[PDB]
Coordinates of C-alpha atoms and ligand atoms in Angstrom, one line a residue:
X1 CA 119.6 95.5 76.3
X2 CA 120.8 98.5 77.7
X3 CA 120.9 102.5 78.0
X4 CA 120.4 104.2 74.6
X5 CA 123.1 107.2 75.2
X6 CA 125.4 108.3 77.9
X7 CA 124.4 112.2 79.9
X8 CA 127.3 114.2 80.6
X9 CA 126.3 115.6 84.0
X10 CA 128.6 118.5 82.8
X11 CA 126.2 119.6 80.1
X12 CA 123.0 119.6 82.1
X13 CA 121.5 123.0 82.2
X14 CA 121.2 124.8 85.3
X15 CA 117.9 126.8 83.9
X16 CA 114.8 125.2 82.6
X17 CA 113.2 126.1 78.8
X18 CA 110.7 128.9 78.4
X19 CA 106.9 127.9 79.0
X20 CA 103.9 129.7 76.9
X21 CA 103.4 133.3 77.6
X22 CA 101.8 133.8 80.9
X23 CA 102.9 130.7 83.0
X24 CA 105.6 130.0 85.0
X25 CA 107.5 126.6 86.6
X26 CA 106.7 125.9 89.8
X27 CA 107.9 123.1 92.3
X28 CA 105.2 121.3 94.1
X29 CA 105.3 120.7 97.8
X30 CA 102.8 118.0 98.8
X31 CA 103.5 118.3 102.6
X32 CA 101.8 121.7 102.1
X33 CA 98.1 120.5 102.2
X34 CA 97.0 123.4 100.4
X35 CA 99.5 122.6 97.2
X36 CA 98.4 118.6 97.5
X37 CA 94.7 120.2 97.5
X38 CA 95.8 122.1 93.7
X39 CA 97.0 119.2 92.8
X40 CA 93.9 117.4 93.8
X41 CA 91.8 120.2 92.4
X42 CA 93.9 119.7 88.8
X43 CA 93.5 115.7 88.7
X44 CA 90.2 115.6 89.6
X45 CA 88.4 117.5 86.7
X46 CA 91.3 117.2 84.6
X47 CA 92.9 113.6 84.2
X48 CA 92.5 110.5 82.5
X49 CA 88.9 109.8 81.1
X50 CA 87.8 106.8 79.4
X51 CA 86.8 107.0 75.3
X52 CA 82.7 108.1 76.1
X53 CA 83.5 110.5 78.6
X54 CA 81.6 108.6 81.2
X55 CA 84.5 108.1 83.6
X56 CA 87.4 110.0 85.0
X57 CA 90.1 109.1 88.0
X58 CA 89.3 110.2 91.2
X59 CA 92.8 109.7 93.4
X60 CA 92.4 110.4 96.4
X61 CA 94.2 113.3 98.4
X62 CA 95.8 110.1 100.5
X63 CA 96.8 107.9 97.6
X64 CA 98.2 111.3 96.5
X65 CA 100.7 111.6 99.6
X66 CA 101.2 107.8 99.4
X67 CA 102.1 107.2 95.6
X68 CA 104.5 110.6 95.7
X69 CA 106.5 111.1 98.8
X70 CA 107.6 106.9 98.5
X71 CA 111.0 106.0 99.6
X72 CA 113.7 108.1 98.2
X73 CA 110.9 111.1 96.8
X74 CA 112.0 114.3 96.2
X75 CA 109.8 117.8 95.8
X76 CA 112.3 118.5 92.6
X77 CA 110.1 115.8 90.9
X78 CA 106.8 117.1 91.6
X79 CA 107.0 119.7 88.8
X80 CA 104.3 122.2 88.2
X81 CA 103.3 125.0 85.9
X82 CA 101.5 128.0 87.5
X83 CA 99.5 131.2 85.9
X84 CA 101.6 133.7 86.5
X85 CA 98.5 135.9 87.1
X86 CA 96.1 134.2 89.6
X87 CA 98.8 131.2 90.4
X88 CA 96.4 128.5 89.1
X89 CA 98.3 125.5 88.7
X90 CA 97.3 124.3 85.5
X91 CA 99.7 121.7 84.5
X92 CA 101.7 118.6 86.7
X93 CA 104.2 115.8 85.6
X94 CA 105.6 113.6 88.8
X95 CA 108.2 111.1 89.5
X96 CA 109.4 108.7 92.3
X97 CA 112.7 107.0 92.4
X98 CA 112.8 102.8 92.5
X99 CA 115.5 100.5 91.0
X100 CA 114.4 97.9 88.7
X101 CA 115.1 94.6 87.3
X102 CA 115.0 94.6 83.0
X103 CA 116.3 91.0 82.5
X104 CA 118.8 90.5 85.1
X105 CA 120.2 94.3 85.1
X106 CA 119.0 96.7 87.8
X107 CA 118.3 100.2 86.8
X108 CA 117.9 103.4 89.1
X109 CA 114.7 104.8 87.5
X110 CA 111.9 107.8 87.9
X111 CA 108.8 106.2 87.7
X112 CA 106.6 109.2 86.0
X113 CA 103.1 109.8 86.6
X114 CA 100.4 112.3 86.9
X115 CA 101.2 113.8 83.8
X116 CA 97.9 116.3 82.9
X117 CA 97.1 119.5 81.4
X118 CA 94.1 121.6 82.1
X119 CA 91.3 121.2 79.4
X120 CA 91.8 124.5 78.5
X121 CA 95.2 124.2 78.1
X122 CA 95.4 121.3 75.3
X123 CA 96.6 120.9 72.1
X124 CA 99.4 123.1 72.6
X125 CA 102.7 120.6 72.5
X126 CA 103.0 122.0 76.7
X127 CA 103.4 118.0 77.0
X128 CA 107.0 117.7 75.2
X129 CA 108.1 120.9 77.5
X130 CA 106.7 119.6 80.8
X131 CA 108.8 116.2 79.9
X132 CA 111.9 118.0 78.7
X133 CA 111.8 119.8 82.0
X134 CA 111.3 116.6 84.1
X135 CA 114.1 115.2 82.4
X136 CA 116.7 117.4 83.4
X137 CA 115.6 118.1 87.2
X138 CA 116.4 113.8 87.4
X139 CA 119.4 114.2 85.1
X140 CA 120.4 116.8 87.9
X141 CA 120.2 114.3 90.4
X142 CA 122.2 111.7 88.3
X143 CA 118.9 109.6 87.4
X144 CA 119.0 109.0 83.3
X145 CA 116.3 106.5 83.1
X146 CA 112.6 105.7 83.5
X147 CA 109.8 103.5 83.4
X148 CA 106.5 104.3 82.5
X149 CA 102.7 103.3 81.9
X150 CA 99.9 104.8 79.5
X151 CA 96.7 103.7 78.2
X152 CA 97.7 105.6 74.7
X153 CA 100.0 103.9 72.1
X154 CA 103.3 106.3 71.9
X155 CA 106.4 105.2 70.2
X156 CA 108.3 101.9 70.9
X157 CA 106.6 100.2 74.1
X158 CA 108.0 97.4 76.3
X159 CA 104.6 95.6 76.8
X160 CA 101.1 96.0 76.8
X161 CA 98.4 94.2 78.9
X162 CA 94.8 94.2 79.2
X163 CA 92.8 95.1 81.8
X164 CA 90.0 92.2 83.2
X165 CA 87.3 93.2 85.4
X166 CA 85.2 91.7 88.3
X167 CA 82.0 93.1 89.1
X168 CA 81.8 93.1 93.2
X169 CA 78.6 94.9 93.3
X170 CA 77.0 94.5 90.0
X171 CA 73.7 96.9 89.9
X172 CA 76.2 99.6 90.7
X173 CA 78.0 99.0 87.9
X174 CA 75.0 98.6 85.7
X175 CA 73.4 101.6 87.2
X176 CA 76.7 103.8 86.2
X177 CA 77.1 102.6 82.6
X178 CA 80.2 100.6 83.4
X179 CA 78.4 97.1 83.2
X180 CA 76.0 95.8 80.5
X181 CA 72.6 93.8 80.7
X182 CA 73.0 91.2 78.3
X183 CA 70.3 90.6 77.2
X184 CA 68.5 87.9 77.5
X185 CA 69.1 88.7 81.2
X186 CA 67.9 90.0 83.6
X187 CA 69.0 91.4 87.0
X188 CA 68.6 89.2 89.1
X189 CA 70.7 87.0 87.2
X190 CA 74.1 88.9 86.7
X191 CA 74.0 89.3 90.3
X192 CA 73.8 85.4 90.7
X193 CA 76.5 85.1 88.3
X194 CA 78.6 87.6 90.7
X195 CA 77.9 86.3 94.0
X196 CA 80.4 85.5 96.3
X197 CA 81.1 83.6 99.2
X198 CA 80.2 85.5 101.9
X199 CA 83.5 84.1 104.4
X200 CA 87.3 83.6 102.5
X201 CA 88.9 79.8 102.7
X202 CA 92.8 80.1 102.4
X203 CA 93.8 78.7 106.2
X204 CA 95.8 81.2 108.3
X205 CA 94.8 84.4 106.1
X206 CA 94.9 87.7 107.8
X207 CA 95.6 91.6 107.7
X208 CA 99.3 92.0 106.5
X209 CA 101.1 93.7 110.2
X210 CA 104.6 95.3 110.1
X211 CA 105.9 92.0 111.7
X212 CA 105.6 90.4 108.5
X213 CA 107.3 92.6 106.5
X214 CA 110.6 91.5 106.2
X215 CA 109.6 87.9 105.1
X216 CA 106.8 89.4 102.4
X217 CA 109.9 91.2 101.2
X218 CA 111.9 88.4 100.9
X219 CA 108.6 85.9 99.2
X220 CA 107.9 89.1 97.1
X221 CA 111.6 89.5 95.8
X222 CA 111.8 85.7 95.2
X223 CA 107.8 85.7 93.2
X224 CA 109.2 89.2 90.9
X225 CA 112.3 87.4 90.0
X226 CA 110.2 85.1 87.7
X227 CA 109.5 88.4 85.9
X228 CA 111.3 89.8 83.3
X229 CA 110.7 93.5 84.1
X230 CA 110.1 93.8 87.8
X231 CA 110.2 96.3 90.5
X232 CA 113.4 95.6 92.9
X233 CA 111.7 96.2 96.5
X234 CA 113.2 97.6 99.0
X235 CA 112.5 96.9 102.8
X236 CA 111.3 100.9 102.8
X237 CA 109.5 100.0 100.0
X238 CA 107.6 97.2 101.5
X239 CA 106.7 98.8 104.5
X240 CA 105.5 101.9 102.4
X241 CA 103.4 100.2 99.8
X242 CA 102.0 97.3 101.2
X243 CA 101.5 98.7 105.3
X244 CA 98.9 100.8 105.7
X245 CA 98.8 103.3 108.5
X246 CA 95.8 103.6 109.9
X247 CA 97.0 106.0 112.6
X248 CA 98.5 108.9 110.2
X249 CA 96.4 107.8 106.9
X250 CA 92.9 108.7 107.3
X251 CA 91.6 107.1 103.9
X252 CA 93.2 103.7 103.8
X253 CA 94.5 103.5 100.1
X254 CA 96.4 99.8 100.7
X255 CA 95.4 96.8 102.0
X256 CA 97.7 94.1 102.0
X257 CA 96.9 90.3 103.5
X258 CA 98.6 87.7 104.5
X259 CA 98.6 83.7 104.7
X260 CA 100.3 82.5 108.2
X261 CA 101.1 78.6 108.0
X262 CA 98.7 77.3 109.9
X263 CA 101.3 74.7 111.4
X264 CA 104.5 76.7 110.5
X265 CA 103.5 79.9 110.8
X266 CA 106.3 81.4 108.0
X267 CA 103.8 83.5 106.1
X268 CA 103.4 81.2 102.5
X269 CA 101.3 83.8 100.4
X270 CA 100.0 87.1 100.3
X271 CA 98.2 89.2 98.4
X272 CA 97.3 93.3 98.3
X273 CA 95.0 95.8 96.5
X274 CA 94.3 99.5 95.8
X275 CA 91.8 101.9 96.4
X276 CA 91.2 104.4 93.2
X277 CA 87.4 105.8 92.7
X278 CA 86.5 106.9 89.6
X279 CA 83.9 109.8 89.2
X280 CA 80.8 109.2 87.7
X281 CA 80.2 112.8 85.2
X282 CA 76.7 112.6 84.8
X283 CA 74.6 110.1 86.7
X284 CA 71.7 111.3 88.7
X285 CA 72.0 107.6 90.7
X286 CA 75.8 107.7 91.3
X287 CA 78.7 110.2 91.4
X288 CA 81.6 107.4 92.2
X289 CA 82.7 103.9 91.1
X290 CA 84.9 102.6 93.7
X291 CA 87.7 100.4 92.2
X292 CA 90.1 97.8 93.8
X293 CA 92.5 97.3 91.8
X294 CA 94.9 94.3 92.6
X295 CA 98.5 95.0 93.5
X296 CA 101.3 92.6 94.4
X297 CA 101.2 89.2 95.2
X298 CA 103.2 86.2 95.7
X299 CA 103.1 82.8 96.7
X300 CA 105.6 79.8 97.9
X301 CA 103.7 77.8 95.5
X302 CA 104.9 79.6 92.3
X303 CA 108.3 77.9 92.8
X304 CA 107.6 74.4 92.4
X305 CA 106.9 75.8 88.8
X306 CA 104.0 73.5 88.6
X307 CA 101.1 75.4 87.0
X308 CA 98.3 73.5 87.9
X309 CA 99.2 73.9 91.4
X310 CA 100.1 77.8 91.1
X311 CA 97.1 78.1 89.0
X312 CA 95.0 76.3 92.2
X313 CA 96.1 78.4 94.6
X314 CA 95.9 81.4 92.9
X315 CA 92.4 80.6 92.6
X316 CA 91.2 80.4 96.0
X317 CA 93.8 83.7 97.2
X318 CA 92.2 85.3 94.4
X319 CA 88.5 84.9 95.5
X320 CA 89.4 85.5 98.9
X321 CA 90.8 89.1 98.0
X322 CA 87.5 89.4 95.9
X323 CA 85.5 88.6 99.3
X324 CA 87.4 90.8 101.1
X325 CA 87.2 93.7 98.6
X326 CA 83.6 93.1 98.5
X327 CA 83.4 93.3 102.2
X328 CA 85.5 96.7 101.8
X329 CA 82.5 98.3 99.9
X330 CA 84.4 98.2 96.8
X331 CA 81.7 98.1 93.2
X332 CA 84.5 96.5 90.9
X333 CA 88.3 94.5 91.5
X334 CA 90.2 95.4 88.4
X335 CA 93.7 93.2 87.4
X336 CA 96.1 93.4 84.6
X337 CA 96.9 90.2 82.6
X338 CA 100.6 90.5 84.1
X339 CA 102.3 88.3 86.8
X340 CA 100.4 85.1 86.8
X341 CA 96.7 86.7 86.3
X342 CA 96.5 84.6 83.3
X343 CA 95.8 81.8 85.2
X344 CA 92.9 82.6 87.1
X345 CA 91.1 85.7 85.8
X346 CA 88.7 84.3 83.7
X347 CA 87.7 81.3 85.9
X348 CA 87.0 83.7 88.6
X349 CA 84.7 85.7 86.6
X350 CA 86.7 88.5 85.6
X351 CA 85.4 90.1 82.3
X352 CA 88.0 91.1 79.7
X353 CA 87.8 95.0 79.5
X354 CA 88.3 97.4 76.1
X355 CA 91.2 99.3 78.4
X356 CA 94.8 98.2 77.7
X357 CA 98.0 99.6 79.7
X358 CA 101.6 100.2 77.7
X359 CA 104.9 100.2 79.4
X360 CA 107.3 102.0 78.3
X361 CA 111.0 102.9 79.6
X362 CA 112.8 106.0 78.5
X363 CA 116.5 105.5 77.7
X364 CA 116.5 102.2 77.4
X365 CA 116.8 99.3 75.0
X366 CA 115.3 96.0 75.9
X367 CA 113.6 93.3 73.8
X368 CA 109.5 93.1 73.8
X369 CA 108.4 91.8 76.9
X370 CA 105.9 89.2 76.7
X371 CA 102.1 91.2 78.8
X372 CA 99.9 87.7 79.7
X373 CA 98.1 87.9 75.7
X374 CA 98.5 86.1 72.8
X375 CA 98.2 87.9 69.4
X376 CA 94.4 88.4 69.9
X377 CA 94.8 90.2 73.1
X378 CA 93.7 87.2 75.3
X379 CA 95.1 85.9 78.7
X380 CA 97.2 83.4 77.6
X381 CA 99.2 81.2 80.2
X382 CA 102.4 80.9 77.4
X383 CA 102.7 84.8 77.2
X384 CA 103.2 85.1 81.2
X385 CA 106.7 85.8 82.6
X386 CA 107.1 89.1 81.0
X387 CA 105.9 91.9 83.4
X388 CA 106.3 91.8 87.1
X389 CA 105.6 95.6 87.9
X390 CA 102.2 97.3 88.7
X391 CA 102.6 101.1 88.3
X392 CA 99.8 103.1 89.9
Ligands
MYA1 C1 115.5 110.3 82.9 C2 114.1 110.8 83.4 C3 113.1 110.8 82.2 C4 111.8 111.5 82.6 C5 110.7 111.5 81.4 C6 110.4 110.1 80.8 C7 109.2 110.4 79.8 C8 107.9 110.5 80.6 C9 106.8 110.5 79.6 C10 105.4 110.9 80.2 C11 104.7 109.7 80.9 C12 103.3 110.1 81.4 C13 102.6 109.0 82.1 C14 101.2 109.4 82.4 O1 101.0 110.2 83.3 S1 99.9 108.7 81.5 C15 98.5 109.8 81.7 C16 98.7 111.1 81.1 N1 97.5 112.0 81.5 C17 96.3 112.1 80.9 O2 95.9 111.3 80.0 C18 95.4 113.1 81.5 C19 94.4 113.6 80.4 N2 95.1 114.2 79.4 C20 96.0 115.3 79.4 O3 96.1 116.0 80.4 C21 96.6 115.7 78.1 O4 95.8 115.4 77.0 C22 98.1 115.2 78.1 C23 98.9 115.8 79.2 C24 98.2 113.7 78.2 C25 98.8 115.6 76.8 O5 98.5 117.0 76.5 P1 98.0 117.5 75.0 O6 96.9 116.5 74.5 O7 97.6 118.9 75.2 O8 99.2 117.3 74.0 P2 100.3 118.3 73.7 O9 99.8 119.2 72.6 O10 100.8 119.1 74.9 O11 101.5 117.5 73.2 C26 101.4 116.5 72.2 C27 102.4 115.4 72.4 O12 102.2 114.8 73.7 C28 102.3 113.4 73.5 N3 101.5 112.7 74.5 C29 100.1 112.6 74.6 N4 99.8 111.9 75.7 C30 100.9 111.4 76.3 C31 101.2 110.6 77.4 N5 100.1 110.1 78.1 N6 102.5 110.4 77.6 C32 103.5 110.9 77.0 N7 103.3 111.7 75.9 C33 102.0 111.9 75.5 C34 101.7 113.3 72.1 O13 102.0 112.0 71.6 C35 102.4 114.4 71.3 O14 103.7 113.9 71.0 P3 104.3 114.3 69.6 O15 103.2 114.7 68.6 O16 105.4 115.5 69.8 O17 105.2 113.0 69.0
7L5_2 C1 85.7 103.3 85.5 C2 86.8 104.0 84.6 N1 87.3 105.2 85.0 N2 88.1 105.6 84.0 C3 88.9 106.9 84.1 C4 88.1 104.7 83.1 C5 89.0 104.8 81.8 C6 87.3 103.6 83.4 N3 87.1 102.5 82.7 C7 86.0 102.7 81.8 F1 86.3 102.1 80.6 F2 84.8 102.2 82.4 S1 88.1 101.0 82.8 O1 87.6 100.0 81.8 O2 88.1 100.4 84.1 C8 89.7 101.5 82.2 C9 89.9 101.8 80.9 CL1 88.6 101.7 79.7 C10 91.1 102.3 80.4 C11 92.2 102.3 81.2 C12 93.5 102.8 80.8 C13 94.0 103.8 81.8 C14 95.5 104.2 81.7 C15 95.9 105.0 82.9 C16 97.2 105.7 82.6 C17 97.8 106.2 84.0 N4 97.9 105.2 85.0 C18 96.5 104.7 85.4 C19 96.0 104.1 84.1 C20 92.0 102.0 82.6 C21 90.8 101.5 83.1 CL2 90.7 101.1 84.8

């Protein structure tokens, strides 16, 4: 594989394109709370919504400030387009900087995200321009590649995986539309089918603390390398992604655990999730759905490369973080069929979902990459080995 064309840095435009009649670029600056509140104010009746218009993302202000201003961020990727008029910001495309792995080559990348358009605003090929102008301010700062994720089709993508879902609180779910009573059913039996224990089992399992954090960066580097296309963690990156700060981050948005030998006490495994809340758009019941949505992992395990032993303890780490989610008031986990998910998703009750995520990487050449499916879009433990990185 490889990069499709060379950028001469001497031909990248100082200036960016013209915008529609009216508005006007503007660089976002998110340590400004009242610029990460437009941003907010944008996203929140304005981003991605699921096929029936039932659903849209709810990111929070704090997963906001957490998933832009990572290691490395700079404002000249938060890019925004203003009214010129009343300075409404009506339009957003972001990146992040990260290096990555695509078989065995590491690539400085953008990761790009929060791409969205006001409603009233569509339809009027803005997209292609807001890209055009993201590309050159990271051209500008010698970055020539990305990686991205969508839950649209667009051309040539690197993988695709489905996204599995396990109810947590099930009469929520039902109550909001997300989650069906089949049938014969009733009630009380889909939330016997979703119980949980009410106390996790993996010895030595704890709250992930910044002492850990250099050896989950080396377990985690060591796990992603069995990936094809991974994310190339940094220690900046660990402690930013997977540590929570409690005392400067009012709405925890990560948490992160971790398995402490009983008898050695090297941490052998851990495992982290997400907070993103969905709103509910009409529902005189319910106006959220509060998601999990699982993160990284790893586990010392994976590298005997015996799969029914991976598969074993992934099955008991997994139902802990369920437990644990549940505990944290969570209605649904959600997961991917990437990593090793395959192995456990359906055994721990996970429902296969009608949502399915593409990756994509701009400038770039690489073979398919198997996502954790088989031909007929189900986990399949032969398809694994493919996609290592969870984009937000
Ligand atoms: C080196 C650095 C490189 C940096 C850049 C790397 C590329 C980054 C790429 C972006 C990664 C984003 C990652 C995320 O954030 S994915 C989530 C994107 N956001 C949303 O879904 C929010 C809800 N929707 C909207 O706000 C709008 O409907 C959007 C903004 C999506 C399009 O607005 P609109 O509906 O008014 O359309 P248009 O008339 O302006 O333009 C039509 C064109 O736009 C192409 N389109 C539609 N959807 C997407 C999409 N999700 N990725 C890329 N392209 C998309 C479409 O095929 C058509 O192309 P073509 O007909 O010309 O062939
Ligand atoms: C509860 C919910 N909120 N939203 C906005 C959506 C689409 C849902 N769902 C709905 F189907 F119930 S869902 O099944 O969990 C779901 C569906 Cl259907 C579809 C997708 C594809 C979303 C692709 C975006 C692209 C940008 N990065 C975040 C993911 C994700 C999810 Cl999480």
């Amino acid at each position: 594989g490889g990069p499709i064309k060379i950028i001469d840095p001497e031909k990248v435009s100082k200036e960016p394109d013209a915008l529609l009649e009216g508005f006007e670029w503007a660089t976002l600056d998110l340590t400004n709370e009242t610029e990460l509140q437009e941003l907010w104010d944008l996203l929140t009746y304005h981003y991605v919504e699921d096929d029936n218009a039932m659903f849209r993302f709810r990111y929070s202000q704090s997963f906001l400030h957490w998933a832009l201003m990572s290691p490395g961020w700079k404002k000249e990727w938060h890019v925004g387009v203003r009214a010129t008029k009343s300075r409404k910001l009506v339009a957003s495309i972001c990146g992040v900087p990260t290096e990555i792995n695509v078989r065995n080559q590491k690539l400085k990348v953008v990761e790009i995200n929060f791409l969205c358009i006001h409603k009233k605003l569509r339809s009027k090929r803005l997209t292609p321009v807001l890209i055009k102008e993201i590309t050159r301010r990271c051209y500008l700062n010698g970055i020539y590649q990305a990686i991205y994720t969508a839950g649209v089709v667009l051309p040539t993508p690197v993988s695709s995986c489905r996204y599995y879902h396990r109810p947590l609180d099930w009469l929520k779910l039902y109550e909001v539309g997300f989650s069906p009573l089949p049938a014969g059913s009733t009630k009380a039996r889909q939330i016997t089918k979703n119980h949980l224990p009410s106390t996790t089992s993996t010895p030595g399992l704890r709250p992930m603390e910044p002492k850990d954090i250099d050896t989950v960066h080396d377990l985690l580097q060591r796990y992603l390398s069995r990936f094809a296309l991974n994310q190339a963690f940094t220690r900046e990156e660990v402690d930013h992604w997977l540590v929570h700060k409690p005392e400067t981050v009012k709405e925890q948005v990560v948490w992160a655990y971790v398995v402490e030998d009983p008898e050695t006490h090297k941490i052998t495994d851990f495992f982290s999730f997400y907070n993103l809340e969905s709103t509910v758009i009409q529902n005189p019941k319910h106006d959220n759905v509060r998601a999990a949505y699982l993160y990284y992992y790893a586990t010392e395990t994976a590298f005997t490369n015996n799969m029914k032993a991976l598969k074993e303890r992934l099955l008991m780490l997994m139902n802990d973080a369920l437990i644990l989610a549940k505990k944290a008031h969570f209605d649904v986990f959600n997961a991917l069929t990437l990593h090793d998910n395959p192995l456990f998703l359906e055994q721990l009750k996970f429902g296969a979902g009608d949502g399915q995520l593409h990756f994509y990487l701009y400038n770039y050449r690489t073979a398919p990459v198997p996502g954790g499916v088989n031909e007929k879009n189900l986990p399949d433990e032969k398809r694994m080995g493919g996609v290592g990185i969870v984009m937000l």
